Amino acid sequence: VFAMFDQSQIQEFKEAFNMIDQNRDGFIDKEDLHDMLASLGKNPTDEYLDAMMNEAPGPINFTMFLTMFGEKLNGTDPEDVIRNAFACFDEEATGFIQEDYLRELLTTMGDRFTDEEVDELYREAPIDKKGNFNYIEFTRILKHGA
């Protein structure tokens, strides 16, 4: 958000946006990234680089860009909010939340998210074998940086 900023990651976030967000039509272009990669000079070729990136959410606009800056990740995610949200679905203040419990909770309620996204989260989330997922260390790592 504009008021709240996580100074550890603001520099990388803004550098990425200034390398991606420019005065253009609005779609993400390979031109700027390729120029940054081959600024020194390299024979341009398409021998084995016919597909660079294809999983952008969609088009980007300066107005929608500012909305995204204010809401999604730029200086957002207060820790108390995450802890309260995770304790809302658990009765123990300890935060031992069964992994399968969160599976159905996420895959049935709200804008439903797939098991693929839950696994994607688990690619970095440390979980016990019995599934009582904890989030202190994971939340700190997400918020400070990596």
Binding site: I82, E91, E117, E120
Partner: protein, 701 residues
Amino acid sequence: EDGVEDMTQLEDLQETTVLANLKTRFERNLIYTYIGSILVSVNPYRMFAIYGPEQVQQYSGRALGENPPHLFAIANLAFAKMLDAKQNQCVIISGESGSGKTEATKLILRCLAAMNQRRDVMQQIKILEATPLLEAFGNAKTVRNDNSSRFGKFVEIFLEGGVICGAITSQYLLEKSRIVFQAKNERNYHIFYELLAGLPAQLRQAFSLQEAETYYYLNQGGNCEIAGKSDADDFRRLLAAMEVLGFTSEDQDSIFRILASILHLGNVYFEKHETDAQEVASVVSAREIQAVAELLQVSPEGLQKAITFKVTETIREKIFTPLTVESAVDARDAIAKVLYALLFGWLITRVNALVSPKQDTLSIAILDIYGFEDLSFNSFEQLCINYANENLQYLFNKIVFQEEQEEYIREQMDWREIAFADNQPCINLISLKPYGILRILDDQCCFPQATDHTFLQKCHYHHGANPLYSKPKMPLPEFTIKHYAGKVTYQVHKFLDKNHDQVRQDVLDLFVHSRTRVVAHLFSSHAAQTYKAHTVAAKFQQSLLDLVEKMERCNPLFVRCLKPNHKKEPGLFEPDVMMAQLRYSGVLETVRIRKVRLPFQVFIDRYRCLVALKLNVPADGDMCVSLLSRLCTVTPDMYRVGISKLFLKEHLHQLLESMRERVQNRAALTLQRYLRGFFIQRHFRSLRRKIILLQSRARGF
């Protein structure tokens, strides 16, 4: 261990919750449940271990804790209350016919006989052998049941410090109009058909009896035979019971003579003969009148005058006024009804005298009362039935409210006066003296030119503004009363014909001077005991008032027998049938009375999402209502949670629940957009910061 025994301890008591708990208990072969001190029993149509001495000793005294529900708990609770208060108590076994009230009464009788005296069981043997006689004289086939008890049996077991003395049996709320009128596809009392079927032939020749289809008092239903009942076997069993009960051959012959006299009196017709100033009813054939006179040992001319004449008798003269056809019909029906009532009273009095007690200091009363009735075509008899059920539901609600008040003072709290709306307005609507429905009916029974239409118009005029009273839109001959079990529509078709039950002094004098001892004794006793009750409704009200007056010197205990399925299938259950039975039995009146009762740990645990509740182990003084003040701007009205936790009113409860579900929605949205942020993080700072570094280093040396 998923089911529960007492639903009073539940935090949210709704009709759906009650149905779910009851069906969960029934699916585990657990019949009996608890509503505070009120037992609920579902008829399983299957033999269950509701007996055995080991159950008696298990429930003996207060050593069990009432963890498992059973009728023996009701029995020993009544015994303990008697030994504590030194006062009588009564147990009311209500419910529909076939719902299991009869064997419940028999099991209670066996349990008391086993646990009180445990040295002599002659009282229970003597009181069980009288059951078939009462069942034959007080049951009939209806459009809903094949064997329905049309009266309230009152068995009083006298106890003297654990010693079982003699028992007194009493009858109440007997249906007088069924003796002379039956609707479609229903019969009279079983006794007439059993007598006409199983009687020896020479008895029939002596009484000039015939098949049941010929008699007018029996053929009105159109189906004089029950598919699945043997009249001869039951009649022989009744003879065996009378022989055991000391009824000699002469007494049985007199009873058969009385019943045959009633049957023959039912077959008398009248013709409209022309007189100088009126129409006069004259008997068609004198054969039936003479047969009745011979069977009852009374004068034939006396009977014919008592049927076709009205007597105005002062000190200095006696005037005979001829009657009309309708008046003669009413007189004949009144004579038949009074004969049957006197005979039943005599049988019960003799049975009581056979097992007469010695002292009267303590007593346990058992009432086997029929319940709510809501058929398709609905009429006067069911109106009286529902009036009696409303008067019983008054006491049921009183007991429920007493338990609620005891719960409110059970722990430590500033006990407030809880509001409670009883069903008094319905009782006033039906039978209040100025303009009650039954009072209007009684007034119309002597008014000059009153018919059913005029009675309906009077009811509509007097009760048009009553919230419980409802008129049909089209001019249909009916009205609707909002009972505790829902709207009930009564069809006014023969309300005036079914209410005429006036017997004059000339008939009583004729019947006293009979040549047989039993009839003369009965009518002399009736004349000695006899009153401004000249209608069926007035006598029903008097009998119900007597029954209630017998039942305030004690604290009643209620047993509610239900029915899971109308097909008597042992195991098959339906939800709509359960809802209908719960509405009719008055169980849901407890839920209506409850509306506050919700728990404490629920608020402790799942209401932290609002302001992320800072404290731990909130105590009796926990910041609880002030939580609402600073979070929801809710008026302080929820009483107190503390130890005694029954505070939350329904609308506040739903408001908080739906606030909670918005909170869950918003928290889920926040988490999901945060997780989308994490996905874009891993995406971008994977595909650049984990790839360009590797490529640059590889290009490096």
